[PDB]
Amino acid sequence: YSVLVIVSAALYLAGIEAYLAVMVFALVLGWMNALYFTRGLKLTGTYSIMIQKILFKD
Amino acid sequence: NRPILFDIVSRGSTADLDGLLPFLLTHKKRLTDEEFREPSTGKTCLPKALLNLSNGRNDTIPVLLDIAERTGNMREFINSPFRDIYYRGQTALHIAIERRCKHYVELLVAQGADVHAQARGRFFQPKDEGGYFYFGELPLSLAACTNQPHIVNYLTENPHKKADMRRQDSRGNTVLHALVAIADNTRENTKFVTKMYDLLLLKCARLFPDSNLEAVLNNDGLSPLMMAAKTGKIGIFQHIIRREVTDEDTRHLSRKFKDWAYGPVYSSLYDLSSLDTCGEEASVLEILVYNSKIENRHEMLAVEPINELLRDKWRKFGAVSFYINVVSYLCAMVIFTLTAYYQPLEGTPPYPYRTTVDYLRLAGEVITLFTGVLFFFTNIKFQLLYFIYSVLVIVSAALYLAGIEAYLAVMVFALVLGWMNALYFTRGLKLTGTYSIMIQKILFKDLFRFLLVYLLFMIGYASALVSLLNPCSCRDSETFSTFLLDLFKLTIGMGDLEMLSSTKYPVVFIILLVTYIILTFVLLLNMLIALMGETVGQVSKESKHIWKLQWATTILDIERSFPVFLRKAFRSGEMVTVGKSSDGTPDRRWCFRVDEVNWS
Amino acid sequence: DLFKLTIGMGDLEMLSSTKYPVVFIILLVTYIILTFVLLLNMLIALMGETVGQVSKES
Amino acid sequence: GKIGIFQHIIRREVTDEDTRHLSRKFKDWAYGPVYSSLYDLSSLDTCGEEASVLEILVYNSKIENRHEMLAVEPINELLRDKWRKFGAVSFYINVVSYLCAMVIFTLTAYYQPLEGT
Amino acid sequence: KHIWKLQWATTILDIERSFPVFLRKAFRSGEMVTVGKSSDGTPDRRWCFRVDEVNWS
Ligand SMILES: CCc1cccc([C@@H](O)CO)c1
């Protein structure tokens, strides 16, 4: 997430419009990452434990 | 001073104490004097002498006792209670019994120690009530709960002061109640608790035969058997249920009499006192099925007399009444549905009844009123759902009579609620043993948690995507709301993908859309495989357990619904002339026959 | 119309006729909940007695 | 993943006075059945000074016996005390901080004008 | 059925590792107690955690 946001900032400083897309992708990862906080809840625990990271890499 | 005396007592030196004795007698200062008592705890010299002992015996305590009897203040000196909140009411006798030393215990009892002293400090309160060791708040209870049979024998049988083993706590607990309270389910604890419970019950029978120590009930109204049932102590509950006394002098205490036993089969008369009470007394069945929330209940209902009693109740008045209930409620609901559908289309409330069909509809309406008033009176004298259904029916009838045309809304809502009450929200056994909705554990209130995570994830994804959509007016938050609606429509169904017209880069939009769809599918698969996993993984021993709990709940509800006379009419078991009682008359106690099989 | 809304091809022209929109909406949303529960339990039983057949079985 | 020796080391008691400083579970006070034992938190809670047995236990241990060792009374009660002292408060603070940061990021990207280059 | 304990332990250790070392020591668990004399004769000041238990045997 941080690499993506820094890449977007580097593109924005460069003057490349493409930043929005890269920056948008980072934001998406930020919402997915918030599930770590929801790991404890029983309903979405099984999804937050291993799906969101390992399943996202695969 | 305090420190020098305490140090001399701790080191066990007697010469210094004998040299301080003339000071004590000359200063007319008793050991109980405020200068010698510890300020924070109210502690006296004697409990300190009891606490720190070497090799089990030291002369410090006898020298203190001689000093106190010489100053003549022994009675106050012995019964000096600790005063701090941590240790309140503790007496030297409690510490003497505590340290497993019998000789100090008997010395203190002979000198005149109070035997019924109650220690109700925060340390001695039950573990749940901010405490540490709830030993029963009594020296005899302390001796019993610390596994000191000799101390119990001495306290209960001594010439100096006889301990009243029928004594009750400030909480009302007897020594048997204390033994139940300290009991756990481990092997050694259950072992010595059962052995000492038998010892104490037999002793109380021997001392004064008429009263049974189990008859004494806690301030909450719970007998030791009832207390074990409520708290969930499987070991002592099991032992009390099948207590058999081989001694013929006191056999009234025994509950599991043996009619005959050839080989593995044992035919036993289990006493049903306080189990099938029939409303005269609280029932161990009622407490076990309703109040006790411990998982041990699953095993607690597994004892032979309780299981066979529930099966007998089901055979006698369980199945027939359950079928009558379900059939009657289904017929009432069918009548309600027919009345609601066939309500007259044209007219104003109230509506006239002219033809025979109108009279049939009126009969259905009065049947509904009968059901509603029945439920109202049943709950008022409190099943919330039935109460809501009944009050909705009543207000619907009131609106119908008063002329309000809103009778159709409340009445149909009551229809749906009544149907769901029978089918969806089952209090006991399900209307059908094979039920399509039986497997699900989803609740209407729970559904909101299921939907909320979807809503939050979707709104977050949409908030991410509208920012990319903004280049395309679009900057207004109204466009954000429109894209929320459009994305919900797209994720629920095909939406032509018009938004890719707005985006500068459609490829990243495609990647985001496909990853969002697959993530949503995986999240759905997880939150639905949870139920499937519970269905294929948790029916191994739990399904039959929850079925047994439902069946017991239905049996007890039907049993309570009956009037007292009919309840006694359907009483299980038979009067048995089990044997000659102590007074010389035969003993007549309700018993249940159990043919238990044990393969050697 | 009710079947069409259950499938997804329904239209909310039903709500225009009714005198009391709020209770009608409440009843319909509850009905969707119960129909979804019925279909979910059907699929649960389907998958359960499908996986009842195992590798040794097949 | 060796549970037995791990329990023995975390609950070690030696009686010999010369070598009684090797104990880790010191009885403090007793009252019949109940008694209080002070377990030694050496390598169980180093506060980041060195490797801590708890951290190796949660992350590095890939054995199926991880839950048994986490159920050992010193470790379990230490985790419960950590949760009680600052676990819930700091967890909710982190949740609120992330949520607000993500909302801020969503707003700033949205309101961004992107007028030309 | 077993993951939840492990996941809560992960949550608490991450939160505790997020803190600076001085903040780590500020919220230490247990208290110093004079357990006894060491080999050299000096008392051993050890951070110890009090656990209350029962033994019926
Ligand atoms: C006889 C059927 C019946 C009607 C009303 C209440 C009950 C029980 O719920 C009593 O609590 C049963």
Swiss-Prot record, chain B:
Binding site for ATP: K43, K48, N52, Y87, R88, G89, Q90, R99
Per-repeat ranges for ANK: 88-117, 135-164, 220-249
Intramembrane segments: 480-499
Tissue distribution: Found in the synoviocytes from patients with (RA) and without (CTR) rheumatoid arthritis (at protein level).
Residues bearing the modification Phosphotyrosine: Y104
Disease per UniProt entry: Brachyolmia 3: A form of brachyolmia, a clinically and genetically heterogeneous skeletal dysplasia primarily affecting the spine and characterized by a short trunk, short stature, and platyspondyly. BCYM3 is an autosomal dominant form with severe scoliosis with or without kyphosis, and flattened irregular cervical vertebrae. Spondylometaphyseal dysplasia Kozlowski type: A form of spondylometaphyseal dysplasia, a group of short stature disorders distinguished by abnormalities in the vertebrae and the metaphyses of the tubular bones. It is characterized by postnatal dwarfism, significant scoliosis and mild metaphyseal abnormalities in the pelvis. The vertebrae exhibit platyspondyly and overfaced pedicles.
Domain notes: The ANK repeat region mediates interaction with Ca(2+)-calmodulin and ATP binding. The ANK repeat region mediates interaction with phosphatidylinositol-4,5-bisphosphate and related phosphatidylinositides.
Family listed: Belongs to the transient receptor (TC 1.A.4) family. TrpV subfamily. TRPV4 sub-subfamily.
Name listed for the protein in its UniProt record: Transient receptor potential cation channel subfamily V member 4
Organism: Homo sapiens (Human)
Lineage per the UniProt record: Eukaryota, Metazoa, Chordata, Craniata, Vertebrata
Underlying gene: TRPV4
Curated annotation (Swiss-Prot), chain D:
Reported tissue expression: Found in the synoviocytes from patients with (RA) and without (CTR) rheumatoid arthritis (at protein level).
Domain of life, source organism: Eukaryota
Transmembrane segments annotated in the record for this chain: 90-110
ANK repeats, residue ranges: 1-18
Compartment list: Cell membrane; Apical cell membrane; Cell junction, Adherens junction; Cell projection, Cilium
Disease: Brachyolmia 3: A form of brachyolmia, a clinically and genetically heterogeneous skeletal dysplasia primarily affecting the spine and characterized by a short trunk, short stature, and platyspondyly. BCYM3 is an autosomal dominant form with severe scoliosis with or without kyphosis, and flattened irregular cervical vertebrae. Spondylometaphyseal dysplasia Kozlowski type: A form of spondylometaphyseal dysplasia, a group of short stature disorders distinguished by abnormalities in the vertebrae and the metaphyses of the tubular bones. It is characterized by postnatal dwarfism, significant scoliosis and mild metaphyseal abnormalities in the pelvis. The vertebrae exhibit platyspondyly and overfaced pedicles.
Subunit and partners: Homotetramer. Self-associates in an isoform-specific manner. Isoform 1 and isoform 5 can oligomerize, but isoform 2, isoform 4 and isoform 6 cannot oligomerize. Interacts with calmodulin. Interacts with Map7 and Src family Tyr protein kinases LYN, SRC, FYN, HCK, LCK and YES. Interacts with CTNNB1. The TRPV4 and CTNNB1 complex can interact with CDH1. Interacts with PACSIN1, PACSIN2 and PACSIN3 (via SH3 domain). Part of a complex containing MLC1, AQP4, HEPACAM and ATP1B1. Interacts with ITPR3.
Function: Non-selective calcium permeant cation channel involved in osmotic sensitivity and mechanosensitivity. Activation by exposure to hypotonicity within the physiological range exhibits an outward rectification. Also activated by heat, low pH, citrate and phorbol esters. Increase of intracellular Ca(2+) potentiates currents. Channel activity seems to be regulated by a calmodulin-dependent mechanism with a negative feedback mechanism. Promotes cell-cell junction formation in skin keratinocytes and plays an important role in the formation and/or maintenance of functional intercellular barriers. (Microbial infection) Facilitates hepatitis C virus (HCV) replication, possibly through its action on DDX3X.
Listed name of the protein: Transient receptor potential cation channel subfamily V member 4
Gene that specifies this protein: TRPV4
